[PDB]
């Protein structure tokens, strides 16, 4: 169970920052996945494999992996 | 059909200000306006409900996606 911070510098508004979570929204063990155009930030907490996340936002633009420790 | 409750600071689709995609059947903390919301995702009709049993804020939506 971990709470990984994202970076997504891609979400500007409320359409990117949709897309940006539609990209993470299937993978498995998420139970949740907050953004914030503030600071470009995702917030996904779950037992979901971070290896995972990571992959699928590549698609989407430029992540960084702010954080990944226990939730 | 749907596998999370989506939460949205605003009930009008052209200004709401979507905050959080909570999986149903789990519950989690929102933070806006200054302030925790803890939510639980009961169901697929994505009721806005606060576990302590109190009314939420007017302005918390949900949605199912």
Known sequence: QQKVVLKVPTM???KTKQKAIEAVAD???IDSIAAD????????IGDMDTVEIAKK???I?????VSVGPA | P???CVYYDGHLPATRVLLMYVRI???ATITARGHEFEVE???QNCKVILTNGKQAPDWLAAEPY
Request: net charge positive; glycine share 10%.
């Open chain 1, 12 to 14: 500007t508004d409320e």
């Open chain 1, 27 to 29: 993978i498995y063990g």
């Open chain 1, 37 to 44: 155009l503030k600071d470009n930030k995702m917030t996904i």
């Open chain 1, 57 to 59: 936002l590549r698609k």
């Open chain 1, 61 to 65: 633009g430029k992540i960084d992996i």
């Open chain 2, 2 to 4: 749907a596998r999370f």
């Open chain 2, 25 to 27: 059947g789990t519950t």
């Open chain 2, 41 to 43: 995702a009961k169901d």
